[PDB]
Nucleic acid binder design. Structure first.
Ligand code: ADP
Ligand code: BEF
Ligand code: MG
Ligand code: MG
Length: 508
RNA sequence: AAAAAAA
């Protein structure tokens, strides 16, 4: 398909809700909804995205815009507009399907649709239903039958379940499908699912197999995604709406980035505790921050430490895929409202999630993928607000930082070293309740995690893996100790032959 | 054992 580029214009023409109203692009009902939100004016992506989406319905849309710049409304406003000027057709059928890589992001997008509804009750006739895992399947279908939504927000897994069973009933008249965080949804582990989704929607469409128009949105994507999505893009042409220069870094420039480099991985923990401590003092507990960790078990562990240290000063929230979905939703809306607190989470919260006025984004270790560094720090400095970010890593993780410059052109100017005092180590380690068996599982989970991204971040396996494993000895206050495992376990890991295995483990 | 995703 023909991929048409539309680079970031220098000055360009101003676009406004009023202008789109007078121009005939937008109806008064949707115009009334967004105006009441009292935004200063449409964001760059929104100005560059709305009219093209409503344009000649023989083209697809790819849109790149930095984090926190209102990409959600950039495709929700047009969708609503499409629904208005087709209100006398199909009516009780899904006309827009929005897909997100995490449940909480899908539920967030739903909430944003509900905000549009609350600003104009006239738009409530265009109902919306979310379809995500961890929710009652029957209840969602009853909601489907009752509301007969024109908009569906979903995660790939639950959506396929519904489509396999009810495609004929609701999805024979889809006109739009949206891939939010598109690049992620087009990666291995999601790509096959979205191809399954796209195929079913096309096969079931009443007009034609190429009727559906596809919208791709993310803060991180290139031309590679257009190739990765070639099977889900129906139209013959495709617009690339980019509000970012080719050479410009995808990371938000307003974020004050820094990296704290330590000798070991374990004392990135100590550095972060000292940083948070310093931050709570200076800000007088007026501190809202998100700290990312590489692993669920380590996240839960890091959470346990931060409670013992800072629960007296701030709420500490634990957020990952092993948290029950009810609790995930509960803490997400709390941290959205709260003025302060520390959200401790995995990369489940790396993309899309919009928490107003986060002061800082902290990172212990590396993200699950290179791009997610951009999305991680993107949780702060949103909607014009300021923000800072700190990356806590060890010496053996520097290749990730270098790769960050080589690939994404992200240069972290502020760099500093760190060595923990004996007092801090005693303070933190004295406040661990975990048995040696628990510490083992935690470090093992980190070994598995770091082993899987050796190639991505150009890590030296002979160096990084022993360092991660050595965390076990540090936490038990005995650097000489190795992780106790069985011969079968060491074999299951496949390092029975590798010298690195012996350096990490002790066969008991 | 390892981040998401019908779990
Ligand atoms: N036109 C606008 N002007 C000011 N703020 C906006 C505008 N559009 C959206 N926002 C704000 O941006 C926040 C998050 O936007 P979001 O859709 O998450 O952007 P992205 O998806 O690109 O990260 C929302 O809380 C919203 O209040
Ligand atoms: F890119 Be945004 F944060 F969804
Ligand atoms: Mg978004
Ligand atoms: Mg924020």
């Amino acid at each position: 398909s023909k991929l048409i580029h539309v680079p970031k214009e220098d000055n360009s023409k101003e676009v406004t809700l009023d202008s789109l109203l007078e121009e005939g692009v937008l109806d008064k009902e949707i115009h009334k909804a967004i105006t009441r939100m009292e935004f200063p004016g449409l964001t760059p992506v929104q100005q560059k995205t709305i009219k093209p989406i409503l344009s000649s319905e023989d083209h697809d849309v790819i849109a790149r815009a930095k984090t926190g710049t209102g990409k959600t409304f950039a495709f929700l406003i047009p969708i609503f507009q499409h629904l208005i000027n087709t209100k006398f057709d199909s009516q009780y059928m899904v006309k827009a399907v929005i897909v997100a890589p995490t449940r909480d992001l899908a539920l967030q997008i739903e909430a944003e649709v509900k905000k549009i509804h609350d600003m104009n009750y006239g738009l409530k006739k265009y109902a919306c239903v979310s379809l995500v895992g961890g929710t009652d399947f029957r209840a969602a279908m009853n909601k489907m039958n009752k509301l007969r939504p024109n908009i569906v927000i979903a995660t790939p897994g639950r959506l396929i379940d519904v489509l396999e069973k009810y495609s004929n009933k609701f999805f024979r008249f889809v006109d739009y499908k949206v891939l939010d965080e598109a690049d992620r949804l087009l990666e291995i582990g999601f790509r096959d699912d979205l191809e399954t989704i796209s195929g079913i929607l096309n096969e079931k469409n009443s007009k034609s197999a190429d009727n559906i128009k596809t919208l791709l949105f993310s803060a991180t994507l290139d031309d590679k995604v257009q190739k990765l999505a070639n099977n889900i893009m129906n139209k013959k042409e495709c617009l690339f709406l980019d509000t970012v220069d080719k050479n410009e870094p995808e990371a938000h420039e307003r974020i004050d980035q820094s990296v704290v480099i330590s000798e070991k991985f374990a004392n990135s923990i100590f550095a972060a505790v000292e940083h948070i401590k310093k931050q709570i003092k200076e800000r007088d507990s007026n501190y809202k921050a998100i700290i990312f960790a590489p692993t669920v078990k380590f996240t839960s562990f890091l959470c346990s430490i931060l409670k013992n240290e800072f629960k007296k000063d701030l709420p500490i929230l634990e957020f990952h895929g092993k948290i029950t979905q009810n609790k995930r939703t509960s803490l997400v809306k709390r941290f959205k409202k709260d003025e302060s607190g520390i959200l401790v989470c995995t990369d489940v919260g790396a993309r899309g999630m919009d928490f107003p006025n986060v002061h800082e984004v902290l990172q212990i270790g590396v993200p699950s993928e290179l791009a997610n560094y951009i999305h991680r720090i993107g949780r702060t400095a949103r909607s014009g607000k300021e923000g800072s970010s700190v990356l806590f890593i060890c010496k053996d993780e520097l290749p990730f930082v270098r790769e960050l410059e080589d690939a994404k052109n992200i240069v972290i100017a502020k760099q500093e070293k760190y060595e923990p005092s004996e007092e801090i180590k005693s303070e933190v380690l004295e406040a661990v309740t975990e048995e040696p068996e628990d510490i083992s599982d935690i470090v093992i989970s980190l070994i598995s995690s770091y082993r899987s991204c050796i190639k991505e971040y150009r890590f030296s396996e002979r160096r990084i893996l022993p360092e991660i494993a050595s965390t076990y000895g540090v936490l038990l206050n005995d650097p000489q100790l190795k992780i106790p495992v069985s011969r079968r376990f060491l074999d299951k890991l496949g390092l029975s032959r590798s010298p690195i295995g012996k350096a990490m483990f002790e066969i008991r």
